[PDB]
Amino acid sequence: ISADQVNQIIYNLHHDPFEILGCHLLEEGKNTKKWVVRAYLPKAEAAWVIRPTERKEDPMNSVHHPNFFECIIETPELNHYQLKVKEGEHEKVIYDPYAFSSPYLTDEDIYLFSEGNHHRIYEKLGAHVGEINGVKGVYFAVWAPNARNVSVIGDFNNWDGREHQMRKRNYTIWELFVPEIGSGTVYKYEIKNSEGHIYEKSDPYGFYREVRPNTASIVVDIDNIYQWHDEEWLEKRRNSDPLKQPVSVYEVHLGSWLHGSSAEKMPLLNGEADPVIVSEWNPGARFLSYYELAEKLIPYVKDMGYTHIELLPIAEHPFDGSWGYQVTGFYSPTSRFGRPEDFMYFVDKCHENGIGVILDWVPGHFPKDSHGLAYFDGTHLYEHADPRIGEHKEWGTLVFNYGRHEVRNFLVANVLFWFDKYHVDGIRVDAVASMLYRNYLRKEGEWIANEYGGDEHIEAVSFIREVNTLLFEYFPGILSIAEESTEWEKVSRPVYDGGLGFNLKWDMGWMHDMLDYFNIDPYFRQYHQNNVTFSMLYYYNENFMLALSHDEIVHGKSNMLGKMPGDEWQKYANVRALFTYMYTHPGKKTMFMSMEFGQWSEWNVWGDLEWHLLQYEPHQQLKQFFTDLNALYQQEPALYTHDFEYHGFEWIDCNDNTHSVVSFLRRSDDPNDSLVVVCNFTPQPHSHYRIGVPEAGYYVELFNSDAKQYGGSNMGNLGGKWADEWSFHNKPYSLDLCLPPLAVLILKLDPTKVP
Ligand SMILES: [Mg+2]
Ligand SMILES: [Mg+2]
Ligand SMILES: [Mg+2]
Ligand SMILES: [Mg+2]
């Protein structure tokens, strides 16, 4: 480029910066092409072009001005890249601001989508505010290859589409530009099928939607509604390995955590809306907005000491009682709680408070509602036409055709969309088995095998691998969490090793073992010591997340207190012992709302949590217990640096079944960070109980779940114990401990103690 051209850019004299900025073809070679990427990055000292799908990174050079950058790259196609931008000591990674020089679909957009590889397809499908022919308006586009006609109906045309008939491009996608309308336009697509039947559809790629049960889509100028402040969070995430950090998740269903009064408006980030009543049977209650949740949930979670909030599915869904798991508006956060910018504000405020956001994401199926994706264009478009692979008959839902390029693209670009536009830090996928198996919940003779004769759903496995490959390439330090309940191998292993590419898997076996164990009267736990210890036998085959989820406190299973045997004191004590054990056992942590304060009743999605219980001491004490346990977890490296290495754990003794005692070490990089954990799972106290330890010295009683401030009896070791040079459990030293009833101790050597 010349200095004249650069200076026109620097000084805002250039007539159209897209002519020069962004990605431009310089020449074509025999088997490759030479491209230049240019950027004007005021205040940046350095920049790079990352090509994350090729695992490449190329420096940019300043050209004529220290803040104007160019990068020349030879490659056949330069479709997917990011800019890394360094401004002083800080780096950010963004998409190129000059990536897309028109609002309309290009030939290249259509080709990539036809192949299933358009990772940013949501920039062009849906509804986007833009300019065509010099006039500002909205560009609409929708994939409906077998429709006979499609028209845009909406508020702007009184729902009559005759003068807003779309144009079909390349026999596949319909488009229309509508001048002088903008954000907040309410619309649907009116489709005529090959039989001549006329019907109405919400926008698959819509960014916002009316409030259930209304279904119209709403135009959002998605890149001009919110200003983020989370660049330092994002940089730390990108440059960190979350597997080596504390990860303690508070699982939340946004609709049912806390309700407000339906007698007043729902406040939003600078504005308000009509209240969204929770149900016709509880009409004085409304949902809180994403704004109000930012103001109330976030400081609540920060004070409790969790590292992450995991949301049950926030994508648009028509029925409260699905909990979010039956989604019809994949590209929009539900309007139950306000607007897209209110959810952005929520995530930005989490990041400000040092809390990450994990979304339950639902790629496995979709319901049959007429406004949604079903039978979209008069054919089985999103779902597979064969019900043996295209329906989950026991659920009444439809299964995506994962092998179909445009369907795969809808879902792969969807997962990326939430990281891009909403800055989320992870995803969790429920019921991954539902996708993996061609015989899932199907009777003999009502499914067919794969091309090799097996039950593996090959197209779904390919899709899951593609999602995880891409997600970690574009967003390296995220969490991708699976619940898979059939012992599929290598769920949380890299795709190149034959894994499915998740980085964490819920330890469902652990969860069953623990809850079944604690439900047993304590005298009888001696016949079930194997529930305590078995999950370590297969533990190192996956990277496990220890999750006690919403699914365990519904349908007659009771909430946590109710699962426990004994009198009220003992029920509380059992809860504290279980969760102390959970937080000391190797693996990351997840627990659901209401578990932290001892709600007696099961979770009810139609009401809110029983907050009045926190007026009473026993619930306050349990909540203080969790507050302190989360604080300890973040403070003790041996509870989180080596979760997934042999070094990080070793049983001391797990043979005393008759007294339901087990003990173990946790380790980290510094030997002085090793912890001694001792568990007593009966109400029998032990005044003298010997436990082998590796070193001489004073072992501080760092945590004691029977402490009085947690509701316990206050039994224990009054600060700590000096080890004896008395070999025990195959260790050269030992502690003679007092073990409180239905409790866990964590001890830690203080090598600086005065003898
Ligand atoms: Mg009409
Ligand atoms: Mg399940
Ligand atoms: Mg058993
Ligand atoms: Mg209530």
Coordinates of C-alpha atoms in Angstrom, one line a residue, residues 230-663:
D230 CA -14.3 -7.5 29.8
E231 CA -11.2 -7.5 27.8
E232 CA -8.9 -8.3 30.6
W233 CA -11.1 -11.3 31.7
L234 CA -11.1 -12.6 28.1
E235 CA -7.3 -12.2 27.8
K236 CA -6.7 -14.2 31.0
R237 CA -9.1 -16.9 29.9
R238 CA -7.4 -17.3 26.5
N239 CA -4.0 -17.5 28.2
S240 CA -5.0 -19.9 30.9
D241 CA -5.7 -23.6 31.3
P242 CA -9.0 -23.9 33.2
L243 CA -8.3 -27.6 33.9
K244 CA -5.6 -26.4 36.4
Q245 CA -7.7 -23.9 38.1
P246 CA -10.4 -24.0 40.7
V247 CA -13.8 -24.5 38.9
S248 CA -16.8 -24.5 41.4
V249 CA -20.0 -24.0 39.5
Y250 CA -23.4 -22.7 40.8
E251 CA -26.0 -24.2 38.5
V252 CA -29.0 -21.9 38.1
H253 CA -32.4 -22.0 36.3
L254 CA -33.0 -18.3 35.6
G255 CA -36.8 -18.5 35.6
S256 CA -37.0 -20.0 39.1
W257 CA -34.2 -18.7 41.3
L258 CA -36.0 -15.5 42.5
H259 CA -39.3 -13.9 41.3
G260 CA -40.4 -10.4 41.6
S261 CA -43.8 -8.6 41.8
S262 CA -46.1 -8.5 38.7
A263 CA -47.5 -5.3 40.0
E264 CA -44.6 -3.3 38.6
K265 CA -42.7 -3.1 35.3
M266 CA -39.6 -5.3 34.7
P267 CA -36.6 -3.0 34.9
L268 CA -34.0 -3.3 32.1
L269 CA -30.6 -1.8 31.6
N270 CA -31.5 1.9 31.1
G271 CA -35.4 1.2 30.3
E272 CA -38.3 -1.1 31.4
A273 CA -40.7 -3.5 30.0
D274 CA -44.1 -5.0 30.9
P275 CA -43.8 -7.7 33.4
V276 CA -43.6 -11.3 32.4
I277 CA -46.0 -13.2 34.6
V278 CA -44.6 -16.5 35.8
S279 CA -47.8 -18.6 35.3
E280 CA -51.6 -18.0 35.2
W281 CA -51.8 -19.9 38.5
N282 CA -49.3 -17.5 40.3
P283 CA -50.2 -14.2 38.7
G284 CA -48.8 -11.9 41.3
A285 CA -45.3 -13.1 40.4
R286 CA -43.1 -12.1 37.5
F287 CA -39.6 -13.1 36.2
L288 CA -36.6 -11.0 37.1
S289 CA -34.8 -9.5 34.1
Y290 CA -31.3 -10.2 33.1
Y291 CA -30.5 -6.8 34.5
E292 CA -32.0 -7.5 37.9
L293 CA -30.3 -10.9 37.9
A294 CA -27.0 -9.1 37.2
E295 CA -27.8 -6.9 40.3
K296 CA -28.9 -9.7 42.6
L297 CA -27.6 -13.1 41.4
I298 CA -24.1 -12.0 40.7
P299 CA -23.2 -10.5 44.1
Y300 CA -24.9 -13.5 45.7
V301 CA -22.7 -15.9 43.8
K302 CA -19.6 -13.8 44.4
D303 CA -20.2 -13.7 48.1
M304 CA -20.7 -17.5 48.1
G305 CA -17.4 -17.9 46.4
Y306 CA -18.3 -19.9 43.3
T307 CA -16.0 -19.4 40.2
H308 CA -18.8 -20.0 37.6
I309 CA -22.5 -19.8 37.1
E310 CA -24.0 -22.5 34.8
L311 CA -27.3 -21.6 33.2
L312 CA -30.0 -24.0 32.3
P313 CA -30.8 -23.3 28.6
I314 CA -31.4 -19.6 27.9
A315 CA -32.1 -20.0 24.2
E316 CA -35.7 -19.1 23.3
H317 CA -38.0 -21.9 24.2
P318 CA -41.8 -21.8 24.3
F319 CA -42.7 -23.8 27.5
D320 CA -41.5 -23.0 31.0
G321 CA -41.9 -26.6 32.0
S322 CA -39.3 -27.9 29.5
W323 CA -36.7 -26.1 31.8
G324 CA -35.3 -24.8 28.5
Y325 CA -34.4 -28.2 27.0
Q326 CA -36.9 -27.9 24.2
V327 CA -35.6 -24.9 22.1
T328 CA -37.1 -23.2 19.2
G329 CA -35.1 -19.9 18.9
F330 CA -31.5 -21.1 18.9
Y331 CA -30.0 -17.6 18.2
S332 CA -31.8 -15.6 20.8
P333 CA -31.6 -15.4 24.6
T334 CA -35.1 -15.8 25.9
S335 CA -37.2 -12.7 26.1
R336 CA -38.7 -13.9 29.5
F337 CA -35.9 -11.9 31.0
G338 CA -35.6 -8.9 28.7
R339 CA -33.5 -8.0 25.7
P340 CA -30.2 -9.3 24.2
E341 CA -28.3 -6.3 25.7
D342 CA -29.6 -7.1 29.1
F343 CA -28.0 -10.6 28.9
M344 CA -24.8 -9.0 27.5
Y345 CA -24.8 -6.8 30.6
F346 CA -25.2 -9.9 32.8
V347 CA -22.2 -11.6 31.3
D348 CA -20.1 -8.5 31.3
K349 CA -20.9 -8.0 35.0
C350 CA -20.0 -11.6 35.8
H351 CA -16.6 -11.0 34.1
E352 CA -16.2 -7.7 36.1
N353 CA -16.7 -9.8 39.3
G354 CA -14.3 -12.6 38.2
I355 CA -17.1 -15.1 37.5
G356 CA -17.4 -17.2 34.4
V357 CA -20.7 -18.1 32.5
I358 CA -21.4 -21.6 31.2
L359 CA -24.4 -22.2 29.0
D360 CA -26.4 -25.4 28.7
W361 CA -26.6 -25.8 25.0
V362 CA -29.1 -28.1 23.3
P363 CA -28.0 -29.4 19.9
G364 CA -29.6 -32.8 20.3
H365 CA -33.2 -32.1 19.2
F366 CA -35.9 -29.7 18.8
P367 CA -39.7 -29.8 19.5
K368 CA -42.4 -29.9 16.9
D369 CA -44.0 -26.5 17.5
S370 CA -45.3 -25.0 14.3
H371 CA -43.4 -21.7 14.6
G372 CA -40.0 -23.5 15.0
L373 CA -37.7 -25.4 12.8
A374 CA -40.0 -28.4 12.0
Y375 CA -40.8 -29.4 8.4
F376 CA -39.5 -25.9 7.7
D377 CA -40.0 -25.5 4.0
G378 CA -42.5 -28.3 3.4
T379 CA -39.9 -30.9 3.7
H380 CA -37.9 -32.5 6.5
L381 CA -35.2 -29.8 6.3
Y382 CA -33.6 -29.5 9.8
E383 CA -34.7 -33.0 11.0
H384 CA -33.9 -36.2 9.2
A385 CA -36.8 -37.5 7.2
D386 CA -36.5 -41.1 8.5
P387 CA -38.3 -41.2 12.0
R388 CA -36.0 -43.9 13.0
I389 CA -33.1 -41.5 13.2
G390 CA -35.1 -38.2 13.0
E391 CA -37.4 -38.4 16.0
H392 CA -37.1 -39.1 19.6
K393 CA -40.5 -40.7 19.9
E394 CA -40.4 -41.1 23.6
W395 CA -39.8 -37.4 23.9
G396 CA -42.1 -36.3 21.2
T397 CA -39.2 -34.2 19.6
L398 CA -37.3 -34.1 16.3
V399 CA -33.6 -34.9 15.8
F400 CA -31.3 -32.7 13.6
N401 CA -30.0 -34.2 10.3
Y402 CA -26.3 -33.8 11.4
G403 CA -25.0 -35.0 8.1
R404 CA -26.8 -32.3 6.1
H405 CA -24.4 -29.5 5.5
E406 CA -26.6 -26.5 6.2
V407 CA -28.0 -28.2 9.3
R408 CA -24.6 -28.9 10.7
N409 CA -23.7 -25.3 9.8
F410 CA -26.7 -23.9 11.7
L411 CA -25.6 -25.7 14.9
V412 CA -21.8 -25.3 14.6
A413 CA -22.1 -21.6 13.9
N414 CA -24.7 -21.4 16.8
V415 CA -22.2 -22.6 19.4
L416 CA -19.7 -20.1 18.1
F417 CA -22.3 -17.4 18.2
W418 CA -22.7 -17.5 21.9
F419 CA -18.9 -17.2 22.5
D420 CA -18.7 -14.4 19.9
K421 CA -21.6 -12.2 20.6
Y422 CA -22.2 -13.0 24.3
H423 CA -18.7 -13.7 25.5
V424 CA -19.6 -16.9 27.4
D425 CA -16.9 -19.0 29.0
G426 CA -18.2 -22.5 28.4
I427 CA -21.0 -24.9 27.3
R428 CA -22.5 -28.0 28.8
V429 CA -24.4 -30.6 26.6
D430 CA -27.1 -32.8 28.5
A431 CA -27.8 -36.3 27.3
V432 CA -25.0 -36.6 24.8
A433 CA -25.9 -40.4 24.4
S434 CA -29.1 -39.2 22.7
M435 CA -26.9 -38.1 19.8
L436 CA -24.3 -40.8 19.9
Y437 CA -26.6 -43.9 19.4
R438 CA -28.7 -44.8 16.5
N439 CA -30.7 -47.2 18.8
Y440 CA -31.3 -44.6 21.6
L441 CA -34.6 -45.3 23.3
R442 CA -35.7 -47.3 20.3
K443 CA -37.2 -50.8 20.2
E444 CA -35.8 -53.8 18.3
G445 CA -36.8 -53.5 14.7
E446 CA -37.4 -49.7 15.0
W447 CA -33.8 -48.4 14.2
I448 CA -31.2 -49.3 11.6
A449 CA -27.6 -49.8 12.0
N450 CA -24.8 -47.5 10.6
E451 CA -23.0 -48.4 7.3
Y452 CA -20.6 -50.7 9.3
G453 CA -23.2 -52.6 11.1
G454 CA -22.9 -50.8 14.4
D455 CA -25.1 -48.7 16.6
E456 CA -22.9 -45.5 16.5
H457 CA -24.5 -42.5 15.0
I458 CA -21.6 -41.6 12.7
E459 CA -22.9 -38.2 11.5
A460 CA -23.5 -37.1 15.1
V461 CA -20.1 -38.2 16.3
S462 CA -18.6 -36.2 13.4
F463 CA -20.6 -33.1 14.3
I464 CA -19.7 -33.3 18.1
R465 CA -16.0 -33.6 17.1
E466 CA -16.3 -30.6 14.7
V467 CA -18.0 -28.4 17.4
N468 CA -15.2 -29.2 19.9
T469 CA -12.4 -28.8 17.4
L470 CA -13.7 -25.4 16.3
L471 CA -14.6 -24.1 19.7
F472 CA -11.2 -24.7 21.2
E473 CA -9.4 -23.3 18.1
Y474 CA -11.4 -20.0 18.1
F475 CA -11.7 -19.7 22.0
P476 CA -8.9 -21.6 23.6
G477 CA -9.4 -21.4 27.2
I478 CA -13.2 -22.3 27.4
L479 CA -15.0 -25.2 29.1
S480 CA -16.8 -27.8 27.0
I481 CA -18.7 -30.1 29.4
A482 CA -20.5 -33.4 28.5
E483 CA -23.0 -35.5 30.4
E484 CA -22.8 -39.0 28.7
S485 CA -24.4 -41.8 30.6
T486 CA -23.4 -45.0 28.6
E487 CA -19.7 -45.2 29.2
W488 CA -18.8 -44.0 25.8
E489 CA -15.0 -43.9 25.8
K490 CA -12.7 -40.8 25.6
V491 CA -15.6 -38.2 25.9
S492 CA -13.2 -35.6 27.4
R493 CA -10.2 -36.4 25.3
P494 CA -8.9 -34.7 22.2
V495 CA -10.4 -35.5 18.8
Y496 CA -6.9 -36.4 17.4
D497 CA -6.8 -39.2 20.0
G498 CA -10.1 -40.5 19.1
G499 CA -12.0 -38.5 21.7
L500 CA -15.1 -36.4 21.4
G501 CA -13.2 -33.3 22.3
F502 CA -14.9 -32.1 25.4
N503 CA -12.6 -31.0 28.3
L504 CA -14.8 -32.2 31.2
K505 CA -17.4 -34.9 31.7
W506 CA -19.9 -35.2 34.5
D507 CA -19.1 -38.2 36.8
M508 CA -22.6 -39.6 36.8
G509 CA -21.3 -42.9 38.5
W510 CA -19.9 -40.8 41.3
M511 CA -23.1 -38.9 41.7
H512 CA -25.1 -42.1 42.0
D513 CA -22.6 -43.7 44.3
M514 CA -22.6 -40.7 46.6
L515 CA -26.2 -40.0 46.8
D516 CA -27.1 -43.7 47.2
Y517 CA -24.4 -43.9 50.0
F518 CA -25.6 -41.0 52.0
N519 CA -29.2 -42.2 51.7
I520 CA -28.2 -45.4 53.6
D521 CA -28.6 -45.4 57.4
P522 CA -25.2 -45.0 58.8
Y523 CA -25.0 -48.4 60.6
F524 CA -25.4 -50.0 57.1
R525 CA -22.8 -47.9 55.3
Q526 CA -20.2 -50.5 56.4
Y527 CA -21.7 -52.8 53.6
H528 CA -21.2 -50.1 51.0
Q529 CA -17.7 -48.7 51.5
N530 CA -17.2 -49.4 47.9
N531 CA -19.6 -46.5 47.0
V532 CA -17.0 -44.2 48.7
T533 CA -14.0 -45.5 46.8
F534 CA -15.0 -47.1 43.5
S535 CA -15.1 -44.0 41.4
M536 CA -11.3 -43.5 41.8
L537 CA -10.8 -46.8 39.9
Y538 CA -11.8 -45.3 36.5
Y539 CA -11.3 -41.6 37.4
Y540 CA -8.2 -41.1 35.3
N541 CA -9.9 -42.2 32.0
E542 CA -11.7 -38.8 31.7
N543 CA -11.4 -35.3 33.1
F544 CA -14.4 -35.5 35.6
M545 CA -16.7 -32.8 36.9
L546 CA -18.3 -33.8 40.2
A547 CA -21.9 -32.6 39.6
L548 CA -24.9 -32.7 41.9
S549 CA -27.4 -31.2 39.5
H550 CA -31.0 -30.0 39.2
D551 CA -32.0 -33.4 37.9
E552 CA -31.3 -34.9 41.3
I553 CA -33.7 -32.7 43.4
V554 CA -36.9 -33.2 41.4
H555 CA -39.4 -36.1 40.6
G556 CA -39.7 -37.5 44.1
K557 CA -36.0 -37.7 44.8
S558 CA -36.1 -35.0 47.5
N559 CA -33.8 -32.1 48.0
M560 CA -30.4 -32.8 49.7
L561 CA -31.6 -32.7 53.3
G562 CA -34.5 -34.9 52.6
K563 CA -32.2 -37.6 51.2
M564 CA -30.4 -38.0 54.4
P565 CA -31.2 -40.4 57.3
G566 CA -31.6 -39.4 60.9
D567 CA -32.7 -36.5 63.0
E568 CA -32.5 -32.8 61.8
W569 CA -28.9 -32.5 63.2
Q570 CA -27.8 -35.5 61.4
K571 CA -29.4 -34.6 58.1
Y572 CA -27.4 -31.3 58.1
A573 CA -24.3 -33.1 59.1
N574 CA -24.6 -35.6 56.3
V575 CA -25.0 -32.8 53.8
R576 CA -21.8 -31.1 55.1
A577 CA -19.9 -34.4 55.1
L578 CA -21.0 -35.2 51.5
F579 CA -20.1 -31.7 50.2
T580 CA -16.8 -31.5 52.1
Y581 CA -15.9 -34.9 50.5
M582 CA -17.0 -33.7 47.2
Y583 CA -14.9 -30.5 47.3
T584 CA -11.8 -32.7 48.4
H585 CA -12.3 -35.5 46.0
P586 CA -10.5 -35.0 42.8
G587 CA -12.5 -33.4 40.0
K588 CA -14.1 -30.0 39.4
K589 CA -17.4 -29.1 41.3
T590 CA -21.0 -28.3 40.3
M591 CA -24.0 -27.9 42.6
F592 CA -27.5 -26.5 41.9
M593 CA -29.3 -23.6 43.5
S594 CA -31.1 -24.3 46.8
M595 CA -28.5 -26.9 47.8
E596 CA -26.4 -24.2 49.5
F597 CA -29.0 -23.2 52.1
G598 CA -30.8 -26.5 52.7
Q599 CA -34.1 -26.0 51.0
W600 CA -36.4 -28.8 52.2
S601 CA -38.6 -28.9 49.2
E602 CA -37.7 -30.2 45.7
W603 CA -36.9 -27.7 43.0
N604 CA -40.1 -26.3 41.5
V605 CA -39.6 -24.7 38.1
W606 CA -42.9 -22.9 38.4
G607 CA -42.1 -21.0 41.6
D608 CA -38.9 -19.5 43.1
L609 CA -36.6 -20.8 45.7
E610 CA -37.6 -20.8 49.4
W611 CA -35.5 -17.8 50.4
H612 CA -37.5 -17.3 53.7
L613 CA -35.5 -20.2 55.1
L614 CA -32.5 -18.0 55.3
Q615 CA -34.2 -16.1 58.3
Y616 CA -33.3 -19.2 60.4
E617 CA -30.0 -20.2 61.9
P618 CA -29.6 -23.8 60.6
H619 CA -30.0 -22.6 57.0
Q620 CA -27.7 -19.6 57.6
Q621 CA -25.0 -21.9 59.1
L622 CA -25.2 -24.2 56.1
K623 CA -24.8 -21.3 53.7
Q624 CA -21.8 -20.1 55.7
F625 CA -20.4 -23.6 55.4
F626 CA -20.5 -23.4 51.6
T627 CA -19.2 -19.9 51.6
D628 CA -16.2 -21.1 53.6
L629 CA -15.7 -24.2 51.6
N630 CA -15.6 -22.3 48.4
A631 CA -13.1 -19.9 49.9
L632 CA -10.9 -22.8 51.0
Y633 CA -11.1 -24.4 47.6
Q634 CA -9.8 -21.3 45.9
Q635 CA -7.1 -20.8 48.5
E636 CA -5.6 -24.4 48.5
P637 CA -3.7 -25.3 45.4
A638 CA -3.8 -29.0 46.2
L639 CA -7.6 -28.9 45.7
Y640 CA -7.3 -27.9 42.1
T641 CA -3.9 -28.0 40.4
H642 CA -3.5 -31.7 40.0
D643 CA -7.0 -33.0 39.8
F644 CA -6.3 -34.9 36.7
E645 CA -2.8 -36.3 37.5
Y646 CA -1.8 -39.2 39.7
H647 CA 0.3 -37.0 41.8
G648 CA -2.7 -35.1 43.0
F649 CA -4.3 -37.8 45.0
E650 CA -3.5 -40.9 47.1
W651 CA -5.5 -42.9 49.5
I652 CA -4.0 -43.1 53.0
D653 CA -6.5 -45.8 54.2
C654 CA -9.8 -46.8 52.8
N655 CA -10.2 -50.3 54.6
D656 CA -12.0 -49.3 57.8
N657 CA -15.5 -50.1 56.4
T658 CA -16.7 -51.1 59.8
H659 CA -16.4 -47.5 61.0
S660 CA -17.1 -45.8 57.5
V661 CA -13.8 -43.9 57.7
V662 CA -11.6 -43.1 54.7
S663 CA -8.5 -40.8 54.4

